[PDB]
Structures are given as C-alpha cells and as structure tokens.
C-alpha cells in the first residue's frame, strides 16, 4: 500500500502552512509585554496567546477546503478549536528534560508555575503537562503533527457549526491521509492513529477546563483589561 | 490678599494626587510592548496611553468632589477629557531643548515622528508640539499644573454630563483657587490665568483632531486589535 497524489498534496500544503505560521527562532517574543516573575505573567501570556491565535488563523486558511467554507463556519471552528491548536503547537517548544516550554532566550523558558502566575490553577496545569509529556513521547513526524492539528480544527462537533456535513467530509479525508501516512511511512505505528485520536479527546477536557478558568478571569475587569482584543473576541461568548 | 484654608486644602490634596499618579522615574515603561522604529509604534503607544488612562482615573478620584458625583457623570467627564489630561500631563516629560518627550532611558525618548509611526498625522502633531512649547514656556508651578488638569477634568460642557450644575460649581471653586494662587504666589502672573484658560481652548481642538484620527484608526480591525481594552472603552463611542 502507498499514498495517492491527492493525499501527498494535502501533506505538502499542510507542512508548508505550518512552516509559514510557526517561527522556530521565537524572535517575535521580544515584542510582547515582558514576562514578570498577583497575575504578573498575565500580560506576557495574553500577548503570547494572541500572537498564536493569529498563527492558527494563518494556518487554518491554508488547510485545503477551509477557505471554501462559510465565514460563519470558519469563525465557529476557530472560536471553539483555537485553544486546542495552541496546546498542540506548543508541543514543538515543550521539552521532556526540563518539563517546560523553551522559546528562545532564558526569559522565554516557561515553567508550569508561570501559567499559575497568569490566572490558571493546577486543575488545568496537571493535565496540560501530562498531555504534553504524553504527546512528546509519541515522537510524531512533522506530517502527523501538522495533520493532527488540521483534524482538530476540522472537527464538525463544535458549537456553532452550520454545514457540518461538508466539515465532516473534510476531516475524514484528512484522517484517511493520517492513517495511511502512519501505515506506509511510520515504522511501528500499529497503535499510533488510535493513540493520536485519543489525544483529540484529551484536548476536549483541556478545552473545557481552560474555558471555565478563562470565564472566571474574563469576569474580573481588573484582569480582562490585561487581555488583548483578539483574545477577548476568540475566547469570548458572542455569536 | 491671601488664600483661604479651604483653597489651600484643595491645592495640597491635588499636589498629593498628582504625586501618587505620576511616576517621575518612568520605570513602569519597561512593562509596555516595546518601541519599534507600518504603525510600528502603535503597540508601545497604545500601552503608554492605556497606562496613563489608569493614572488620570486615579488622579480624578482624589479631586475633591469628583467621587461624590454619579458614576455615569464620572464616566462622561473621563471619556471626554482623558486625552486632554494625557496632553497636559505629558508636558512634565516634554523638553524644549530636544522638542520631544523624554521618559527615562534612551528607548523612551520620543520624537514627533514616533506618533506618526503610531497612526497619527501632522494635522495632530503640528498643534500638539506647538501646544507643548506654548505650555512649557508658561513655566507653571506644580500647583497651577495640577489645578489646570482638575479644571479641564471638571468642565461641565462635556457630551454626556447630567448634573452639570454641580460640576460647574466644582470647576468654578477650583478656578477661584487658581486665580488666587497666581495673584498671591506667582510674581508676574498678571496675564497667566487668561493664558491658561486659553490653553483649555487649544485642548478642545486637539481633542477634536485626535478623535477624528482615532476613529479612522479604530475602524481598521488590523489596527484596533493593537489597542488595549481600556483605550477601546475610553476612546470608544458607547453610552
């Protein structure tokens, strides 16, 4: 068995989309409000997240068939999956050695306590770190990592979606690509596809925990003022 | 002639209010998104302005009688006068030597071209600089500088004000203090009170120019996203 021409184009276009939207030098980080170590990390992390939301939008626009969807459907998918894509893409900076995200210099080496100093609790950080360790151990190929993010983004089971029949078709077409990629190109990937599909289930509960914690944060004007207009809009509850 | 006990209390309370809300070390400036020299200065200036809006709110709360007003009236006065207080208070960092605002290190030495690189035109910068040079030459006492800002903030001729009879009383009581302060404590201040009242007229046209320019800026989502939630709220058009 081997990958069709169409499936190969999907992989190439996604890898190039990731490459365009993920800067491995983390150079743009010096333009955010600086890290400070009561809710001292909120400005830097609001800025980091906002910058990432822009990247996820840029990536989504290059997922074949996403641009063809309704602006409304595109918004619904982005609003509900943005945080999950942030969690997934952050794995590229997550290191098993230090159990932290390392983004450039010594100032952008982020421990779990930083997220604590940014309005979040161990209820979110316990499974976020566990999710990162679990995902890091899968030693995903760039093709799988990028495919998983596109499967996640194209989940039709999102609140707000209208043409969910078209979205389910896009996602299944992408899963066929992943399942085959593993089969043909990943030695000892017998259990991988399932292991990755389970990682999408973990993202849902992590989405849920973040949402609760963010609601509490966003309801305090003294904190919501430290957020950015894009973060407010994307994590907000408007329809 | 000499100042009453009541008028002296007004001066003391205002000077202390200014001292609490104006940090002469400009140390907090390192916490803003950094200066970058298309609309490269917008993040740093959005942050600088937002920080100043917080200061002006802190100051206003210590102006005798302001806290006693309606939350609505307090908002109306703040929304329409905030930019004028920013313009007034910025004079403390304005230098006649370099024709720029000098706030701490070499990175917070701001020339007129910086405001240009932040979405504003020479239609605003020509009179802003002229206003600063004119105000700097008045060599105002700290008492006069602080009194002028409180007169400006307590202008009852603002869109949105309700109990404008009470506000006009507060302002007139403050003008009596200024007029007397100059008379008794300022040698050669024969024309000063009038010269300062004229500076309030200049602030209105500068308010007007900024408002036009800000509307143009805030109407472009790619730019409004670079602003802060407080700036959006204060310079916004909600009632």
């Amino acid at each position: 068995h081997m990958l069709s021409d169409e499936q190969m184009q999907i992989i190439n276009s996604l890898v190039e989309a990731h490459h365009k939207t993920y800067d491995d030098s983390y150079s743009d980080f010096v333009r955010f409000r600086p890290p400070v170590r009561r809710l001292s990390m909120l400005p830097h992390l609001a800025d980091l997240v906002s910058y990432s939301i822009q990247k996820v939008i840029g990536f989504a626009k290059m997922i074949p068939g996403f641009r063809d969807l309704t602006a409304e459907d595109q918004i619904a998918l982005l609003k509900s999956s943005a945080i999950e894509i942030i969690m997934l893409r952050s794995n590229q900076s997550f290191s098993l050695e230090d159990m932290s995200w390392s983004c450039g210099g010594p100032d952008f080496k982020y421990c779990i306590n930083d997220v604590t100093k940014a309005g979040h609790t161990l209820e979110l950080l316990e499974p976020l770190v566990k999710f990162q360790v679990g995902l890091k151990k899968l030693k995903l190929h760039e093709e799988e990592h990028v495919l998983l993010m596109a499967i996640c983004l194209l989940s039709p089971d999102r609140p707000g979606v209208q043409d969910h029949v078209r979205i389910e078709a896009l996602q299944d077409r992408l899963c066929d690509v992943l399942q085959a990629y593993i089969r043909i190109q990943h030695p000892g990937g017998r259990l991988l596809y399932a292991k990755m599909i389970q990682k999408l289930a973990d993202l849902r509960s992590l989405n849920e925990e973040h949402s609760k914690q963010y609601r509490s944060l966003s309801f305090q004007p003294e904190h919501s003022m430290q957020l950015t207009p894009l973060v407010l809009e994307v994590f907000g509850s408007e329809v | 002639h000499m100042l009453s006990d009541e008028q002296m209390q007004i001066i003391n309370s205002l000077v202390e209010a200014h001292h609490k809300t104006y940090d002469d070390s400009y140390s907090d400036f390192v916490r803003f998104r950094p200066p970058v020299r298309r609309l490269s200065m917008l993040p740093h200036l959005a942050d600088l302005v937002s920080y100043s809006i917080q200061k002006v709110i802190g100051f206003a709360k210590m102006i005798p009688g302001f806290r006693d007003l309606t939350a609505e009236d307090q908002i109306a006065l703040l929304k329409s006068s905030a930019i004028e207080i920013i313009m007034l208070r910025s004079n403390q960092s304005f230098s006649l030597e370099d024709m720029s605002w000098s706030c701490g290190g070499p990175d917070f030495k701001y020339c007129i071209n910086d405001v240009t690189k932040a979405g504003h035109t020479l239609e605003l910068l020509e009179p802003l600089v002229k206003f600063q040079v004119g105000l700097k030459k008045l060599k105002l006492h700290e008492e006069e500088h602080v009194l002028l800002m409180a007169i400006c903030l307590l202008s009852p001729d603002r869109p949105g004000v309700q109990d404008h009879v009470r506000i006009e009383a507060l302002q007139d009581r403050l003008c009596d203090v200024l007029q007397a302060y100059i008379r008794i404590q300022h040698p050669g201040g024969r024309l000063l009170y009038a010269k300062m009242i004229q500076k309030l007229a200049d602030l209105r046209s500068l308010n007007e120019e900024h408002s036009k320019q800000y509307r143009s800026l805030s109407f472009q989502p790619e730019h409004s996203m670079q602003l802060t939630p407080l700036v959006l709220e204060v310079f916004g058009s909600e009632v």
């Binding site: 626009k61 602006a71 918004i75 894009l230 | -």
Partner: peptide
C-alpha cells in the same frame, strides 16, 4: 467578530 473577519481576509 470584527477582527476574526478581517484576519480571515
């Protein structure tokens, strides 16, 4: 969703 709309071109 002003910003999202713009960001999506």
């Amino acid at each position: 969703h002003k910003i999202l709309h713009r960001l999506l071109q």
